[PDB]
Amino acid sequence: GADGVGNASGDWHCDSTWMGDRVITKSTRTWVLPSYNNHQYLEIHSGSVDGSNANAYFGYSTPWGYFDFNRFHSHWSPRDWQRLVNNYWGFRPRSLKVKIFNIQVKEVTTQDGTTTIANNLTSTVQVFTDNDYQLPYVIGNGTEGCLPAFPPQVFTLPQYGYATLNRNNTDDPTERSSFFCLEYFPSKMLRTGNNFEFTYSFEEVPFHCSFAPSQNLFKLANPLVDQYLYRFVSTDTSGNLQFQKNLKARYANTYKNWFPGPMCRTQGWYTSAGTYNNKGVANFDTSNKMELEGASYQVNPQPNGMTNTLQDSNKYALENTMIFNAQNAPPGTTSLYQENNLLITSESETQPVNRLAYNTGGQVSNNNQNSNTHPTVGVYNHQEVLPGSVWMDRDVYLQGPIWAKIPETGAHFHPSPAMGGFGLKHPPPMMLIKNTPVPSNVAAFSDVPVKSFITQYSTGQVTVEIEWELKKENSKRWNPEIQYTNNYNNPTFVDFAPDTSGEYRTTRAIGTRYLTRPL
Amino acid sequence: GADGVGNASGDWHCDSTWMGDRVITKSTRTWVLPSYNNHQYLEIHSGSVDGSNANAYFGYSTPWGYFDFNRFHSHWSPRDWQRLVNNYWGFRPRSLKVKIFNIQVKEVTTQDGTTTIANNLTSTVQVFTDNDYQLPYVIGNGTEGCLPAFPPQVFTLPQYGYATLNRNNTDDPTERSSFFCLEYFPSKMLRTGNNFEFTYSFEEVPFHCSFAPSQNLFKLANPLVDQYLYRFVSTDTSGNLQFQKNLKARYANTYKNWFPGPMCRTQGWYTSAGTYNNKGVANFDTSNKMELEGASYQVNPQPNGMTNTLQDSNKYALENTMIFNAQNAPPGTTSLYQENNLLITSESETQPVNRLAYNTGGQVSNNNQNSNTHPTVGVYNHQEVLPGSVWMDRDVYLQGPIWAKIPETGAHFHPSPAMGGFGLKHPPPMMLIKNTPVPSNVAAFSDVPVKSFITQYSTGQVTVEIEWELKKENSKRWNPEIQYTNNYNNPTFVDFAPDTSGEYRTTRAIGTRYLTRPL
Amino acid sequence: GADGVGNASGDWHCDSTWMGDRVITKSTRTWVLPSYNNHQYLEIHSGSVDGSNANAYFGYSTPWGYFDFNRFHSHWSPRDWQRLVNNYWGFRPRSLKVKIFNIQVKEVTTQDGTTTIANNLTSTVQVFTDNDYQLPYVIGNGTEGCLPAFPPQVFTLPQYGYATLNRNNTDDPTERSSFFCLEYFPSKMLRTGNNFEFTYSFEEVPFHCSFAPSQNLFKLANPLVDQYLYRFVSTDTSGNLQFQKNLKARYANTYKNWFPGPMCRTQGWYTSAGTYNNKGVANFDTSNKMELEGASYQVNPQPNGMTNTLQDSNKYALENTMIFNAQNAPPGTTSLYQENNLLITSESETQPVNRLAYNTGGQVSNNNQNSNTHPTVGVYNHQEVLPGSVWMDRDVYLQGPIWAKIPETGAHFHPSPAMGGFGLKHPPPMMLIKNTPVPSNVAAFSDVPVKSFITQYSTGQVTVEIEWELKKENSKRWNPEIQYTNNYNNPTFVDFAPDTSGEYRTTRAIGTRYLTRPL
């Protein structure tokens, strides 16, 4: 932008603007960027870890870092989120603007145990966006490093890396393994006066459904009126078939037009009461898994179409659950966490249309009845998509992801990501940034590449603006709705606020489904 | 319409008009409307009934009643239906017009065991349509109360009620239970001179397929020509692999492009011969079921994609069958019915592409073969939608439903209702009507609402006009087709006609699939 | 309107329409009108009753009845009210439309213990509005007879009567007592085809404040900074004056710009725990009272400016409280009611700016200090309006009144009615209606007025439409707000819904103050 050393290249924008059918969120944060890998690209790999060869991989770490705004709380204050979920039947993203500005590059020198930091006014950072999706898209896998929830917090940009193909579930590559060089893209170079701006339009995507059903999928018939349909009930002692009319309100017997969503049975576990759970279990051997390339992988939180719990029940299908930490956690922690440390979400709103993850799905005939053979049924633990099936996709959370990239295979079905949010063919592109290397003193020629660099890091601001489209509520429900509310019994701190040490406290996961609709 | 006491507000229209690619049906009937619940809204509920807690519910009954034209015989005479199904490959509804007129409100007084009926010229009825689908949509669940099949028959409008959510499969409500007040809508008020008119356009929907396949899905290859493809046949005594060419007409061995529809195995039962059936069976424990919200429900007639019987066979998968009564039945009857009382439909036309409901679906490899281990297979009793699968949706019947509302969840697959007919996102809206309350003598003030009303009922005519689009047959079949025909051996009455007592007799269910097409 | 016998003169309108800054409510109800006093005007009076001569009065009852829509639930469904109070900082009425239509006049004859009811097609009702406020305005005194909360309920119009002046607190009139004849106004006469319409604009009036303060009136100073002001603290042993700086956050000592509202101390009583209350008290002798014309009257709920309770406390100043019945009650009941029968409102939201009704207001110096005389203070139990005082007026409730007429005296202060709502100089005018008398058989002349009339009553519909202006919330609060929500533990019925007998159940009083604002 050529603002120059003494002129700011942008202003602080954090706001929300509510229009009748649209809302515009604006978020600004301060970032800091290390020089990762000391300006080197490094092959990274691993064999089997923790007794699973699904943990083997081959890939690369890069000197670059990237901006990740793919969580709802990056854009939405808690109050704004409340206003959203209490009043609207749905929402979707429409457009995006990003600005990176007020660049400051610092040099670091260490001498005799003391560290000195100074401006380097002539250094650059490099920024580009991968508009054609030519790089592995690591955004939307639920990884850390997003713009923080709380605007004053200063955050470190995560390092860009990726896994390509590995051979036979080992740490070796294959002939098809790809290396991607990020310097092989055009990128803008910014000194301290320069800035970067980017605009993007979302593709057409369905509204997220921010309502809960007020009817049960199998109870849709008028309770006052019989069906004109008849069901087989019994055989008499001579084997003749006997039938009965399907009476009003007998929902066990009514013919059905529509069927519940697909399910994969998932083990149920009791929360807050240990005495009901089986003691000293190691989950991993009995976890739900899918096989790929000769290895077994955990598939949490299972495909869409189930509910992980019943309302006002302490039993959860944990592998069907999005589980968040109430606090930020250090990288690499292996510590065991307990329920009170975590935010365990509930999909219970969808229980009228989604099957319960920890029960059987149903039963079908498994034999051929005859004079000597009584009819029998088998139960089933999984059932995939059926003609005429309906379900609700997983809810989104203030703490949760927004979008995910639909993999490019040429074939898919119902592209809504398991974690929740908007499946996108062309998502917001990766935004990559790195500190340009500055060599240190070099006296003599060599054909060997320079390895010795001045230690530098950079800092600046980033602004993200998203236009959201809203779907208005159009309910005729007479009695009041359930609404998210700030109710606490004798609080010692304000939730969604900094505490006495300045830590931002969040003790609840807030979903979107409060208002109701009939089916 | 302000016609006035002595002027009719509409005329009787029952006709059909056949245009080349369209047909317009017009139906007029006389209705009678009780004052249900004596102008009160009543909470209705139930616990477990007949040993099933799937029969528990919570809901409301309303003073309103509603017009239900959602059966084919409301619009189609038997002869017209014959003309449709013998000559056309498909049809779909396009537009709708409804008129309610010639309102007559009667007051009823009972004194000393004698009942007197008189006109009340100044009373009103109230009518409205739920255009935004803001109320539970109870139409399209197969319940009674439709416009009668036979035009002179006078019918009672059914009472509007609905089930909302209940708690833990009991008779209690939950926090999410909805109460809907129908007086919270604008509605037109009609005295005896007034009328009501409504028009509606159907959304684009696929033609119903009124043909049967003349080829088997697995027999599509030219019987005169070998495939250029080879199959594994055996291993020799040294374990070497052996292969053979797939020969002409060997349809057991041909490679396949396409696969049959999804299936859920359903128990088969013999009709008209009791000796083959298992004696004294109570079906309910061994019925097919699906689990929802912690309860088990019968899912008849199963999802689309199966056939319930084979042509010229007496074995039926009864829970895969639409079963109608030949006669109208009284409300609430628990009597046992026998086969000769009922119309048991057959989907046998689809047997070349739909799998047979009472057999296994197939078999797949269940182990890993090696030097010491012979290959084995398991059979499967259910198989859901596969890539490249094809099937035919259930046929529609003169006696059967027309449309159903697709539930509003944001996610579904192949929205064609299990019962048969057209799945609609925005179906013809509920048309609701009630007798406006007229208080009786009130001498003194009270803040308590008036409970004492003059007993009234109303009667009038309703006309429904539907424009249907037709898909012309374009067959090159040389030999004659199967056609629905009026063939009876020594009849003692005319079918689809009133008998000596005036009862309208219908002894057959008439489907649509007579003409054939190659695949 | 001259619709005629067989033509409806209006339609049913109950709806709400939400525009961005305005909301339009439309309500329609069915009414029934007795012929009160058999078409006679009657002097009514009373002496001392229950030992209080404040109960003496002189006045008149009229044959007329009147429409009273002066309660919020006449216009607002519970869900709509929820939407209002959760999202907006205020509202006020703007315009009004009323229609009376579908008139039906019935004649009643009783013979041998049996009652017969028939239409009288040629009878009239008479309607007029008192546009110039020339009659005693009885609307807005908290009396029964309003349009019901629940739209299907049919209600009886209350009888119009009024009290004029009485002599010396007895049952006699004075020379200044006024008799008002309602037939001395022009009025429209309606047969069964006719209707009546009226439109009205509200005067400019302040928005009701639908928010609660998030700051305490005495805590407004920055807690991080000292005042530059000093306070007298002590005298030393020689009598010299000593002073100290007012330190940061010491809100006991800070100089104040502003002062709390006016108060009248009111006795506090414990709810739900009887053991803390004084036993067997008769309240009336110790009630708060004001004297007028030589008699003593209870002044509940006291003037504005107090709070009746503290948050999460069981102590209430009951005479400072609006107390509603959860149910409709019969006229004239003397039964004792208990807390669980009643809705006891809480003004606790205003506790940061309004003084607590059951404590003392403060203390002031009551003597002159000197060498021999220690300073003393008296406490005070009442304090009226002070310069620089601020307070919040009483909240409004879904169950409560909307407006009140400011008395016409030429002098008043802060005209907001004690009960809550909008003080209006020219409120919506009285709407009066009566059944025109129809004499019975008269054979001979007399100069004495006819006393013998055919017994008649009338019924019809009334529609009321109000345009409301809204004040949008403009909060920067980061953390979530308190919101009214439909939370019930194991409900056996749906609140704000009809129960199994059809009774409309309301177990909560819903105020407007949920959102917060800083001072």
Numbering used by the authors:
A (entry chain D), B (entry chain H), C (entry chain 2): 198 to 716
Question: What is the paper's account of this structure, in its own sentences?
Answer:
The cap open reading frame encodes three viral proteins (VP), VP1, VP2, and VP3, that form the capsid shell. All AAV capsids exhibit T = 1 icosahedral symmetry, but only the shared C-terminal VP3 region has been resolved, while the extended N-termini of VP1 and VP2 are intrinsically disordered. Within VP3, the central core motif is an eight-stranded β-barrel (jellyroll motif) formed by two sets of four antiparallel β-sheets (βBIDG and βCHEF), with an additional βA-strand and one α-helix.
For AAVpo.1 and AAVpo.6 capsid structures were generated from 512,823 and 539,729 particles, resulting in final maps with resolutions of 1.79 and 1.77 Å, respectively. Both AAVs share very similar loop conformations in VR-I, -VII, the HI-loop, and VR-IX. AAVpo.1 shows a ~2-fold higher transduction efficiency in Lec-2 cells as compared to Pro-5, indicating a preference for terminal galactose. This behavior is surprising, considering the high sequence identity and structural similarity of AAVpo.1 to AAV5. For the AAVpo.1 capsid, this is not surprising as there is little sequence conservation with the AAV9 residues around the 2-fold region. In contrast, AAVpo.1 is not recognized by mAb1-6 and weakly by mAb2-7.
